[model samples]
Target: MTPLETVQLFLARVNALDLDGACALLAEDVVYDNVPMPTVHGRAAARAFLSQLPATAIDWETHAIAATGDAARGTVLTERTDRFTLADGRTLAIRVMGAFDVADGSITAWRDYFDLGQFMAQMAP
Candidate 1:
């Protein structure tokens, strides 16, 4: 699969809440950076982080894939809206910008950036 396609599939799996499937697209030493949050190193760490999603949110949806590229470079970028229902029963549609480095159909590095204030506002009562 192309770098972009790998990322697309990864997101699909994640949105589907398929933790195993999502981790399948990652390299054994994959590094996932959640921006303001701590970085998750290695596939095991990534899996651990993904496993926690269900406790906090569900119904993840991706809207609008802004751009993708590779040219044998192995770098990909995805700008989209990711929506999910929180455990508190509130739904949030967060605007996200993600960068990925893929090699041999596996994601080696992943980074996601989103507005913390916006997320806090959405989660606020």
Candidate 2:
């Protein structure tokens, strides 16, 4: 698959929250480095990370996409302005970036970067 195709699939799975299916698109030895915690490798771990998301955090839209041979990135200028009920019973808007790396028809690594402060401010009482 091309880089754009890989990013599209990744975004689709995320918007649908198909954690298992998303995991299927990952490389066995995939590495996540930008997170605040330890680097995660392998598909199972990636699936688990996705599973931790607040289920009510729904509705994702791809505002734009731009890709290179090995890198595909997009801004999902989402419209989820409504509050999403969190596992902790709090609600807030969700915003984030999707950065993807593709090689040999699969996503080798994926990254999400966002403003925690902004997200929290939206939830402030």
Candidate 3:
């Protein structure tokens, strides 16, 4: 698939929280460094991380895309929005960006960048 196609598929899988599908797009040794936590390495670990995403606590969406030879990088902005309802029914929202790198028809790495402060403030106590 073309880089754009690969990226679009990746987005679809992510939006669906299809950890298995997303894992299919990742390289065996893929690495993901999502914030507020430690870096995850390898496809299995990545999938496990994705599975932890709170299905009912947040809403997600994609923003932009860009590509070059054997690699594509873009930002996806996810918002907890007003949909945030914690176990105790607290309201919260957050926005963040993830930079993706795809190679050889698979995503080899993903690094997310965002202000934890902003996220915290949105879900402030």
- Highest-scoring model, lDDT: 1
State every prediction's TM-score relative to the real structure.
Answer: 0.80, 0.69, 0.69
RMSD of 2: 4.5
Per-residue error (Å), model 3, residue 90: 6.0
| Residue pairs in candidate 1 whose N, alpha carbon or C atoms collide under 3 angstroms | none
Cα-based lDDT for every prediction? 0.78, 0.63, 0.64
lDDT of 2 by residue, 1-125 (tens): 66777666766776675767777878887876444456788788887766665665654666677775543333222222223466676765655555667776677776656666776576676
lDDT tens readout by residue for model 3, 13-100: 6556565786898888988887766899999988787655344443354545556564344333333222345555666555566656
Residue 25 accuracy (lDDT) in model 3: 89
Candidate 2, residue 68: Cα displacement in angstroms equals 1.0
Candidate No. with top TM-score: 1
Rank ordering of all candidates by lDDT, starting from the highest: 1, 3, 2
Which is the winner by lDDT between candidate 2 and candidate 3? 3
